[PDB]
Design a protein around this ligand. Sequence first.
Ligand SMILES: C[C@H](N)[C@@H](CCCCCC(=O)O)NC(=O)O
Ligand SMILES: C[C@H](N)[C@@H](CCCCCC(=O)O)NC(=O)O
Lengths: 219, 219
Amino acid sequence: SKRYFVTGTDTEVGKTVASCALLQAAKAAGYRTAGYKPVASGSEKTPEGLRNSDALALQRNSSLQLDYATVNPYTFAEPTSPHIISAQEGRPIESLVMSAGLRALEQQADWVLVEGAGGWFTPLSDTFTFADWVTQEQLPVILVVGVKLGCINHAMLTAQVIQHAGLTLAGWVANDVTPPGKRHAEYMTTLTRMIPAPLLGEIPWLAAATGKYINLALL
Amino acid sequence: SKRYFVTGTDTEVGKTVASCALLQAAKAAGYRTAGYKPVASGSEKTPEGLRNSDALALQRNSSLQLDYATVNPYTFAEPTSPHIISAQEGRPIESLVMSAGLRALEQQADWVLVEGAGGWFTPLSDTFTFADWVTQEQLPVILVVGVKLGCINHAMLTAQVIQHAGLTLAGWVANDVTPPGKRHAEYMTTLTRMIPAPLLGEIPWLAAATGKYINLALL
Ligand SMILES: C[C@H](N)[C@@H](CCCCCC(=O)O)NC(=O)O
Ligand SMILES: C[C@H](N)[C@@H](CCCCCC(=O)O)NC(=O)O
């Protein structure tokens, strides 16, 4: 299976918007697809248990019909860092369960997209971050950049840290998080020049069918 | 002179609030102090030229009376990345002028605080970032962290990149950018454990006399 990890420059950069656009393009290219969000915090109660909305978006954008717990093994109600609510609830986030879940998807999908929680360095326990699991699984990384003031600095910090860990930065996606503003073209040029990986596409500001904005031929 | 560079985890983390608190504490400890903001964008017109409000805060919190242009050599009206408006206006941001200005302050002050524009990797030209000048001047760095969701990731990215450049992370300051919330203590504990430098103090949420929240004995 092709496998990719999607991370964002900041919270609220629209990372799941770009993940669904990636999933839609892969399905159009003929892949049997699966989204995976091993850890999620900020979930709703339903008759069947807690359901996180980003995870639900990945489930309905996968081309395989998949059960919710296959898409998202660890679901926490409170929208805070996973290591805080894991400790609070007495439910350890185990690396082996996170890896077993990815293997289970690879039985049935040949293009798997893995979305983390938060940014690169989100703690999962007091001695373990999301970055440690991604390095361990040796996943190529796709960076989602919300285009706004301050994103050049965040895109550059994240890009140097992934490369320092010896991982491949497979590409980046620009997500227009605000209406058109004055320095949009100059920001897109600086980001293109400075991020050492291909721009896969730009999703316009929309307050669903977004696969067309992604060029999967560059991945 | 002692010299420090202040950088923030994101835009609007209240970096100049922490710079003025640092300047107030140094003055209380008996230093002849000077703030320096070599580059600023987002300035007002006055009868004497453009004036940037952060720069004005540094000027009035310095214990020496200083002229505005000594505090802030490069002033741009538009609030965007310095390399965009520098190119637009046809006024190159020169490293030698930025360094000459720091030396000029060192003639008269023995404790100089240097504040950048934006975050670590703010471009000053197409081939030169703020990070390049700070590495060149070999300044110790103080990190200002706004405590909010998403700051663990940003504080960790910035801390690893400064250390990778071989610079000293002298310490960090926690700035409470929102009213008290649910996971404030747990966030302060995770940030203390993960940032490899002493916590110098925490400034409470206030929508001016803040020197008391800084322990200068740890610098
Ligand atoms: C306008 C902002 N306040 C700041 C410049 C921000 C540059 C951000 C660059 C980026 O996107 O990383 N200017 C200044 O502090 O003087
Ligand atoms: C609640 C957020 N949306 C996210 C967790 C953010 C963790 C941020 C940690 C930090 O401060 O760096 N959860 C999630 O995506 O499932």
